[PDB]
């Protein structure tokens, strides 16, 4: 059935629990305060979606919608001290499609070449600059893929950093 999906896994003696709420097709301003006390918010953004367009509007890049959703959930009144772990996915499809089409299709003021690195850093910067609260929260960004287990390692390290910094703030030492 639909609803929130709950996932458990143990990694280096830590029991990670994750809650997928993509099945919730309703107003998010009525249940998002339930997740007020979460260690981190893992946000997935597909890099290969700059060329694509959402069929609902036919003039709406899915990357712009991802940016809107990320900004909405980042600067929420409840997540004022919660860290966000960004996952820029499908780096390979981006690698070929940037060779085919420039990133100017999505952002009209890109002003750059068609190499993977410039566009990747550009999308990362455009996402991270949407963090208006640059004092009490941090964004950790990855590029995933690699068909490996480095993703859980990155999540573990980022969660450990979040926990340590939370303790430091609670002590006043940060």
């Amino acid at each position: 059935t639909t609803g929130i999906v709950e996932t458990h896994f143990t990694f280096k003696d830590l029991y990670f629990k994750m809650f997928d709420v993509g099945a919730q097709r309703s107003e998010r301003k009525k249940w998002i305060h339930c997740f007020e006390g979460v260690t981190a918010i893992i946000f997935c953004v597909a890099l290969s979606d700059y060329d694509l367009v959402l069929a609902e509007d036919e003039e709406m890049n899915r990357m712009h919608a991802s940016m809107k959703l990320f900004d909405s959930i980042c600067n929420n009144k409840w997540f004022t001290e919660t860290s966000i772990i960004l996952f820029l996915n499908k780096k390979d499809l981006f690698e070929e499609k940037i060779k085919r089409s420039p990133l100017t299709i999505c952002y009209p003021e890109y002003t750059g070449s068609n190499t993977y690195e410039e566009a990747a850093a550009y999308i990362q910067c455009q996402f991270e600059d949407l963090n208006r609260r640059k004092d009490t929260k941090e964004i950790y960004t990855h590029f995933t893929c690699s068909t490996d287990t480095k993703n859980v390692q990155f999540v573990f390290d980022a969660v450990t950093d979040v926990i340590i910094k939370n303790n430091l703030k609670e002590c006043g030492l940060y």
């Binding site: 059935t1 639909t2 609803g3 929130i4 709950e6 709420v21 919730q24 097709r25 309703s26 107003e27 009525k30 249940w31 339930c34």
Partner: protein, 338 residues
């Protein structure tokens, strides 16, 4: 002839509005001006209930006016004997994202729901000792906001999929399905006779339904924001509503319009819950500013404050004998004022 249908609907709305205007010959405050004020009302925290380790989102008294149930985001459903503060049961839950609970009018069952879009029925009396699940009610595609019992075999639920529903507990299929709102239905209030019920939604409107027909009978507007809670007047022909515009409003069924608004200039936060007293004179409403204000329902002047919660006053309930009030907050503490 779609435009003809639009014109016909506009004509119907215009004539309904004309009837509503013609009904108005006075105001509730004008008639009640002669009545004597309640004066200051002061209640003290007699019993404080502890044990929840997260925000309490719901509660519901029992018909015996002694036992109540509390639901919290720690994933428990605790049943309290308020007289002695002794806990009776603590039901573990499949999911922790609970947003509502209810107590069967006989005392034999409880219900809970939340972000799993499932209503779950728990039988308090068991030959197995544990309060194990007696019934699951899938079918909603949104978070389940409220739920109430008609009898041991009938339950009404509302949800974020913009529809309410009646259920056959033994069958497990919905008998009657109420659609017609345009936003997430957030609360409902069953009448004492059990034949009708009102339900307010994020569409800034309330609708009155009869549970035999799945056909809306009346629709009330007037609020500017989401309807967070509704309570139904003891007489049976009126009901109050709280909302995010920091106001409560009293609607009368037999006049099909408002009768009074309860607000003040020094209040800006929204209302989380409203409830009436036994006679109906008192309107107790809980706010986001950690306070439960009491209004003279017949005049609109504030008559007291219940303070002592450190966080949002989520839920509010008055006993059937009308002797005490119970408040539950995000600070994980239930209190009993009396």
């Amino acid at each position: 002839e779609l435009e003809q249908l639009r014109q016909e609907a506009e004509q119907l709305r215009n004539q309904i509005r004309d009837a509503r205007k013609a009904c108005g010959d006075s105001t509730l405050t004008q008639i009640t001006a002669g009545l004597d004020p309640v004066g200051r009302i002061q209640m003290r925290t007699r019993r404080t209930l502890r044990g929840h380790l997260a925000k309490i989102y719901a509660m519901h008294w029992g018909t015996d006016s002694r036992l109540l149930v509390s639901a919290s985001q720690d994933g428990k459903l605790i049943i309290w004997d308020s007289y002695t503060t002794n806990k009776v049961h603590a039901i573990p839950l499949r999911s922790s994202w609970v947003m509502t609970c209810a107590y069967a009018p006989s005392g034999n069952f409880v219900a809970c729901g939340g972000l799993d879009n499932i209503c779950s029925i728990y039988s308090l009396k068991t030959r197995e000792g544990n309060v194990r699940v007696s019934r699951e009610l899938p079918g909603h595609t949104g978070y389940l906001s409220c739920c109430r019992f008609l009898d041991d075999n009938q339950i009404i639920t509302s949800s974020g999929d913009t529809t309410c529903a009646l259920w056959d507990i033994e069958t497990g299929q919905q008998t009657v399905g109420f659609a017609g709102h345009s936003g997430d239905v957030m609360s409902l209030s069953l009448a004492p006779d059990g034949r009708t019920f009102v339900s307010g939604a994020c569409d800034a409107s309330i609708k009155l339904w009869d549970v035999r027909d799945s056909m809306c009978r009346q629709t009330f507007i007037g609020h500017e924001s989401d309807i967070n809670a509704v309570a139904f007047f003891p007489n049976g022909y009126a009901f109050t509503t709280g909302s995010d515009d920091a106001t409560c409003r009293l609607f009368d069924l037999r006049a099909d319009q408002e009768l009074l608004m309860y607000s003040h200039d020094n209040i800006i936060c929204g209302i989380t819950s409203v409830a009436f007293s036994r006679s109906g004179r008192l309107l107790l409403a809980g706010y986001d500013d950690f306070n439960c204000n009491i209004w003279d329902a017949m005049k609109g002047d504030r008559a007291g404050v219940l303070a002592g919660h450190d966080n949002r006053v989520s839920c509010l309930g008055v006993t059937d004998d009308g002797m005490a009030v119970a408040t539950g907050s995000w600070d994980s503490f239930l209190k009993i004022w009396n």
